[PDB]
Write a protein that holds these residues in place. Sequence first.
Motif, PDB file in Angstrom:
ATOM      1  N   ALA B  38       7.202   8.857  -0.895  1.00 51.68           N
ATOM      2  CA  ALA B  38       6.795   7.461  -0.869  1.00 51.68           C
ATOM      3  C   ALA B  38       5.275   7.417  -0.759  1.00 51.68           C
ATOM      4  O   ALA B  38       4.667   8.373  -0.272  1.00 51.68           O
ATOM      5  CB  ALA B  38       7.442   6.712   0.307  1.00 51.68           C
ATOM      6  N   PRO B  39       4.639   6.321  -1.198  1.00 52.11           N
ATOM      7  CA  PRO B  39       5.186   5.078  -1.747  1.00 52.11           C
ATOM      8  C   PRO B  39       5.580   5.190  -3.204  1.00 52.11           C
ATOM      9  O   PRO B  39       6.379   4.390  -3.684  1.00 52.11           O
ATOM     10  CB  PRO B  39       4.022   4.102  -1.601  1.00 52.11           C
ATOM     11  CG  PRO B  39       2.828   4.954  -1.783  1.00 52.11           C
ATOM     12  CD  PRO B  39       3.167   6.278  -1.146  1.00 52.11           C
ATOM     13  N   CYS B  40       5.011   6.165  -3.898  1.00 53.38           N
ATOM     14  CA  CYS B  40       5.154   6.209  -5.340  1.00 53.38           C
ATOM     15  C   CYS B  40       6.626   6.349  -5.719  1.00 53.38           C
ATOM     16  O   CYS B  40       7.324   7.219  -5.183  1.00 53.38           O
ATOM     17  CB  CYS B  40       4.354   7.368  -5.921  1.00 53.38           C
ATOM     18  SG  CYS B  40       2.571   7.151  -5.812  1.00 53.38           S
ATOM     19  N   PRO B  41       7.136   5.513  -6.624  1.00 48.88           N
ATOM     20  CA  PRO B  41       8.519   5.669  -7.103  1.00 48.88           C
ATOM     21  C   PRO B  41       8.653   6.507  -8.367  1.00 48.88           C
ATOM     22  O   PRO B  41       9.780   6.678  -8.841  1.00 48.88           O
ATOM     23  CB  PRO B  41       8.906   4.216  -7.385  1.00 48.88           C
ATOM     24  CG  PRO B  41       7.650   3.659  -7.974  1.00 48.88           C
ATOM     25  CD  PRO B  41       6.496   4.355  -7.274  1.00 48.88           C
ATOM     26  N   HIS B  42       7.550   7.023  -8.905  1.00 44.42           N
ATOM     27  CA  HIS B  42       7.575   7.813 -10.123  1.00 44.42           C
ATOM     28  C   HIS B  42       6.539   8.918 -10.007  1.00 44.42           C
ATOM     29  O   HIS B  42       5.490   8.740  -9.383  1.00 44.42           O
ATOM     30  CB  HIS B  42       7.280   6.942 -11.345  1.00 44.42           C
ATOM     31  N   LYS B  45       1.876   8.963 -14.142  1.00 45.43           N
ATOM     32  CA  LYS B  45       0.554   8.525 -13.718  1.00 45.43           C
ATOM     33  C   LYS B  45       0.634   7.230 -12.915  1.00 45.43           C
ATOM     34  O   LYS B  45       1.587   6.455 -13.021  1.00 45.43           O
ATOM     35  CB  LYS B  45      -0.362   8.318 -14.922  1.00 45.43           C
ATOM     36  N   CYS B  46      -0.395   7.004 -12.102  1.00 38.16           N
ATOM     37  CA  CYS B  46      -0.489   5.773 -11.327  1.00 38.16           C
ATOM     38  C   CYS B  46      -1.049   4.657 -12.202  1.00 38.16           C
ATOM     39  O   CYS B  46      -2.173   4.785 -12.698  1.00 38.16           O
ATOM     40  CB  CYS B  46      -1.383   5.964 -10.113  1.00 38.16           C
ATOM     41  SG  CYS B  46      -1.717   4.431  -9.224  1.00 38.16           S
ATOM     42  N   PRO B  47      -0.322   3.555 -12.414  1.00 39.20           N
ATOM     43  CA  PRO B  47      -0.836   2.509 -13.311  1.00 39.20           C
ATOM     44  C   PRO B  47      -2.088   1.816 -12.805  1.00 39.20           C
ATOM     45  O   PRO B  47      -2.782   1.183 -13.610  1.00 39.20           O
ATOM     46  CB  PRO B  47       0.336   1.528 -13.416  1.00 39.20           C
ATOM     47  CG  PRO B  47       1.136   1.750 -12.194  1.00 39.20           C
ATOM     48  CD  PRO B  47       0.992   3.194 -11.850  1.00 39.20           C
ATOM     49  N   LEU B  48      -2.406   1.914 -11.514  1.00 35.96           N
ATOM     50  CA  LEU B  48      -3.505   1.164 -10.919  1.00 35.96           C
ATOM     51  C   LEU B  48      -4.798   1.966 -10.816  1.00 35.96           C
ATOM     52  O   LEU B  48      -5.770   1.473 -10.236  1.00 35.96           O
ATOM     53  CB  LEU B  48      -3.103   0.668  -9.527  1.00 35.96           C
ATOM     54  N   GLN B  49      -4.844   3.173 -11.367  1.00 32.89           N
ATOM     55  CA  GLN B  49      -5.947   4.092 -11.109  1.00 32.89           C
ATOM     56  C   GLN B  49      -7.106   3.844 -12.067  1.00 32.89           C
ATOM     57  O   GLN B  49      -6.967   4.018 -13.281  1.00 32.89           O
ATOM     58  CB  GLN B  49      -5.476   5.538 -11.222  1.00 32.89           C
ATOM     59  N   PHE B  66      -5.608  -2.669  -6.253  1.00 29.21           N
ATOM     60  CA  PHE B  66      -5.402  -1.345  -5.691  1.00 29.21           C
ATOM     61  C   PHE B  66      -4.147  -1.330  -4.829  1.00 29.21           C
ATOM     62  O   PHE B  66      -3.697  -2.363  -4.327  1.00 29.21           O
ATOM     63  CB  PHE B  66      -6.631  -0.897  -4.883  1.00 29.21           C
ATOM     64  N   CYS B  67      -3.586  -0.131  -4.666  1.00 30.87           N
ATOM     65  CA  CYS B  67      -2.282   0.057  -4.031  1.00 30.87           C
ATOM     66  C   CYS B  67      -2.439   0.162  -2.513  1.00 30.87           C
ATOM     67  O   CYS B  67      -2.215   1.206  -1.895  1.00 30.87           O
ATOM     68  CB  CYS B  67      -1.598   1.293  -4.598  1.00 30.87           C
ATOM     69  SG  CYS B  67       0.090   1.543  -4.012  1.00 30.87           S
ATOM     70  N   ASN B  68      -2.825  -0.958  -1.908  1.00 35.26           N
ATOM     71  CA  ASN B  68      -2.929  -1.047  -0.460  1.00 35.26           C
ATOM     72  C   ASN B  68      -1.579  -1.403   0.155  1.00 35.26           C
ATOM     73  O   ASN B  68      -0.614  -1.737  -0.536  1.00 35.26           O
ATOM     74  CB  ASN B  68      -3.992  -2.068  -0.063  1.00 35.26           C
ATOM     75  N   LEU B 164       6.106  -5.092  -9.146  1.00 34.77           N
ATOM     76  CA  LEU B 164       6.707  -3.812  -8.822  1.00 34.77           C
ATOM     77  C   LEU B 164       6.001  -2.681  -9.554  1.00 34.77           C
ATOM     78  O   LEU B 164       5.563  -2.828 -10.702  1.00 34.77           O
ATOM     79  CB  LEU B 164       8.185  -3.795  -9.202  1.00 34.77           C
ATOM     80  N   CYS B 165       5.903  -1.552  -8.863  1.00 36.25           N
ATOM     81  CA  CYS B 165       5.612  -0.267  -9.480  1.00 36.25           C
ATOM     82  C   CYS B 165       6.965   0.355  -9.810  1.00 36.25           C
ATOM     83  O   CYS B 165       7.751   0.653  -8.909  1.00 36.25           O
ATOM     84  CB  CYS B 165       4.788   0.599  -8.530  1.00 36.25           C
ATOM     85  SG  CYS B 165       4.532   2.310  -9.022  1.00 36.25           S
ATOM     86  N   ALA B 166       7.253   0.513 -11.098  1.00 39.66           N
ATOM     87  CA  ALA B 166       8.609   0.820 -11.528  1.00 39.66           C
ATOM     88  C   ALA B 166       8.804   2.318 -11.711  1.00 39.66           C
ATOM     89  O   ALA B 166       7.849   3.050 -11.979  1.00 39.66           O
ATOM     90  CB  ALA B 166       8.915   0.100 -12.838  1.00 39.66           C
TER      91      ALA B 166
HETATM   92  S1  SF4 Z   1       0.761   1.692  -7.880  1.00 38.21           S
HETATM   93 FE1  SF4 Z   1       0.166   3.897  -8.097  1.00 38.21          FE
HETATM   94  S2  SF4 Z   1      -0.304   4.588  -5.992  1.00 38.21           S
HETATM   95 FE2  SF4 Z   1       0.875   2.604  -5.856  1.00 38.21          FE
HETATM   96  S3  SF4 Z   1       3.066   3.243  -5.646  1.00 38.21           S
HETATM   97 FE3  SF4 Z   1       2.694   2.953  -7.837  1.00 38.21          FE
HETATM   98  S4  SF4 Z   1       2.075   5.031  -8.619  1.00 38.21           S
HETATM   99 FE4  SF4 Z   1       1.899   5.083  -6.408  1.00 38.21          FE
END
Ligand code: SF4
Lengths: 61, 280, 168, 308
Positions: B38-42, B45-49, B66-68, B164-166
């Motif tokens: 966690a937190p990442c569900p996949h 790559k991180c979509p928010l980077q 950002f993923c706060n 959601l981050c899917a």
């Molecule tokens: S937005 Fe990025 S950092 Fe946040 S949970 Fe999803 S993959 Fe992880």
Amino acid sequence: FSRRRIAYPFYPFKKLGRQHPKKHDTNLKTAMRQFLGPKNYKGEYVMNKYFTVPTNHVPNY
Amino acid sequence: MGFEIIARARQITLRPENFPDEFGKIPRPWNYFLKVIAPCPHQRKCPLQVGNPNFYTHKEGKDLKFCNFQKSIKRPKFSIELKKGKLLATSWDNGRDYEILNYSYLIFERSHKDENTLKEIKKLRNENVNGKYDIGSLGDDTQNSWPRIINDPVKRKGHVMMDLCAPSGELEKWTVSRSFSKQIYHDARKSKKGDLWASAAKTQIKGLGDLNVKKFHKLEKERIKQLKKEERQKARKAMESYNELEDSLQFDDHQFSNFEVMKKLSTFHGNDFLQHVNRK
Amino acid sequence: YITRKLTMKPLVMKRVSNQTGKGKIASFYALVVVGDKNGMVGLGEGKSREEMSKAIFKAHWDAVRNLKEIPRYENRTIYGDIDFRYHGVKLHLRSAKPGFGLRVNHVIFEICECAGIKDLSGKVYKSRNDMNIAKGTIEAFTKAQKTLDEVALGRGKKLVDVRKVYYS
Amino acid sequence: PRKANLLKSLARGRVRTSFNKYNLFNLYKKGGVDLKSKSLYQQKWTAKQETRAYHGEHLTEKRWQTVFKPKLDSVIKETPFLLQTFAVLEKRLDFALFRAMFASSVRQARQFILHGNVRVNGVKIKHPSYTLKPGDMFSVKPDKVLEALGAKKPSFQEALKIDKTQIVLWNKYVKEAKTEPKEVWEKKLENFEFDPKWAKNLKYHDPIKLSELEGDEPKARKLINLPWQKNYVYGRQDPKKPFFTPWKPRPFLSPFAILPHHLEISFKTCHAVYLRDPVARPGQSEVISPFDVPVHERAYMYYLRNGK
RNA sequence: AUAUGAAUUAAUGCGAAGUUGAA
RNA sequence: AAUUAUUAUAUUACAGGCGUUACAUUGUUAAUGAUCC
RNA sequence: CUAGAGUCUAGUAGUAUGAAUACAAUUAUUUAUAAUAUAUAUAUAAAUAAUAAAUGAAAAUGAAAGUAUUCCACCUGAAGAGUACGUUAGCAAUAAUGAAACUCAAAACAAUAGACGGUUACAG
RNA sequence: UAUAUAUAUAAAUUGAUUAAAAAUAAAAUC
Ligand code: SF4
Ligand SMILES: [Mg+2]
Ligand SMILES: [Mg+2]
């Protein structure tokens, strides 16, 4: 700072624009052609000042 | 900045680009293997980077996200006694019993050294790829691969919308309604940020807004390809300037003023040196 | 006169830091030489924080200001040997036959090329800093060199007498 | 020696000892050698490239180093002392041929020497490295000099097609003259700055067929009667000579026609005399080069230390 | 004596992430 | 009777939405668009 | 620490800005003489302090770290190492002489700006 | 005894969309 510098003419010349993909031309060849001028059917380049030798005892350089 | 730190750590550890078309969570090499809890569900790559923190400071970065992750904690006595006075309890230029704290976080779980886990990971990567999880998908439909609620759900009559981050890995807007069901609406209507949502929705569209990080990924790649035009433009820009200089200084009509001519020479050498160190 | 005739060549171009409390501040030092190739040369220095172009700019003006006439023998070489000590550089420079190259250290090469010194052979002992080499080079060129005419007049002698005899 | 390759590449833009059109353009567009914003080593390397492309491209580098003479010779303007860096090569036989305008290149002069067309004081010399002493007289077979200073002999097919086109245009001219003769005569006078029989005197010519004239050059010779080339295919008056037989100077000859000081030439006989080794004098150097003194002095400093 | 080998044995050099003192 | 309108009745595009800014750009200090029911 | 003496003597041992000569602008103090009538704000010298020129990487030196001459001793990157071995003396202790292989692209000096210290005070 | 011949069509390898070239290098001809 030394750079491998392609010997482009110091003077300005009409460069390439949008080209047919199969033209496969280079700016240096265009500079060559503009320096010479049109090519005659005999193979000559009459339009140039340097194609023909002088004849009045004054060298043409 | 902190979100950047976690994103970079995740990128270097998982290396999303090294396993394209691999969806879901299988431990990743870095006899050594690691996965994200966690937190990442996949594991993709991180979509928010966005690479550089400094660009959060620009006018165009005024809507980046950002993923706060927030939490609430009730202040003890000392904080209550401590956060009092002009120095600390006023607008620096009503009181609460609690603080809302922001933090980003990340977790890795490490596989067990054995003749079991290694072959297990190897075979999982060989024979059963988890296909192209579509936008809207719930992954394996277990807690590991559930979409995470990464924004406070917005709730109105009958319908709850969620960002959601899917497990597919794209930002998603999922809308639940009283229509699609009553129980799912009940649960989504108690959903909050930082929860894993675990059901189907009547619409599961992409989270289009502030996906400009994907627009930014274009800009940086534009620069790299066109950076190499920059030096090449700068060559002719300075060449023609000096070729103009030498013509009227070899011809010596000196239309160009003595002040300005020596300015060109300053640019010529200054541009030269700046190219030198950029190699370093 | 100034732009068309004088030639400018950068000799030193570098970044010097002045680490202040907040952070490392980096500025650009430039040392240049301007000479007409016809018996006048000068050195200039510039320091600029924002871009080296301004450093070279002020260096060019400073070199123009300090432009000075340089003694020359036959307009091609130094009058005699110059042995000079400058802040830790030892310059031993020797006049040479016509057609002799500039067989010297590179910094001295650009200085001579700018100042019109066609012929010279020299060695740099002790420290080899380009900065000090250039400064000492100009100083030894102008202070440490005396014209044969001036020497003869100071000795009250005619040039025919002071001139060396030919031996073979 | 060096195997010639990419000698005339426009990207490189190195001038060669040749009368070629590409060499002419490379000389034209260069302007001057760029020694600025360069360290001393880079200046020396550029000077080497430019000067060594011209003076002795065929010579091997480790051979040129041995040939190179660190001690030069010199006999108000300034003497260009260091242009004499490559004066040692000027006494080589092939260089003497090229400077005498007995060849269109140093490599062509080399082939002339190696193929036995050259004599020095009446003995056939077959070695390009033979060094000429002052006062030597050397001669080249006149046919090879005429080939060197003449246009390429066209093939039979090429000249046949050229004649086809010439007949076409001559017929066009006479047609237009017949249609509008008076103003044709007047406007021809306009460039030069009425007799109706003028256009009557002019006579047509019959278009030839390539398929039927192919492989029969004596027949094609009789079949052509243009006013300017009567009874010979274009460029092939006597098809058994190595050059364009109605002898024509080669194209692009004026740019490279320098008369050397150290040689005295007799073009009528294709002979020359080596007066002296080239020597620099106040304001003039007899080493014919396309580069300025700074380039030569940088090359000289390079070769003094052998690149150190 | 000039060498060549030696169980037994003296000192010191390096490096791996560290461990311990506060000179 | 044909057409055109109007007026009803159907007719489906749709209207409607205090849905969205992790949905933007303007405008200002609501609108258009995009998407969703 | 060793011997002889009744604690002392006799000892072993040898650790923990070279010398000389010639020359070199001032000022201000003193200091010691030599005069001339406290005054000549007296001259001649040496000591002290700041200089000039000069030297130096600079700090700094500034009648020497200057200009020159002569003699000796010493140095040749850091660490290994003043270590090992051998010898020399010593009852011994110790001392003197004194390497080598391996490892590295370092190491060091003066000065500049900084943040650091229970470093100093001082203020706001 | 004229002579800046002009028109069309067709193709045109590698890289690239112009100061990005390979390349007068090949082939062909003398
Ligand atoms: S937005 Fe990025 S950092 Fe946040 S949970 Fe999803 S993959 Fe992880
Ligand atoms: Mg290079
Ligand atoms: Mg292609």
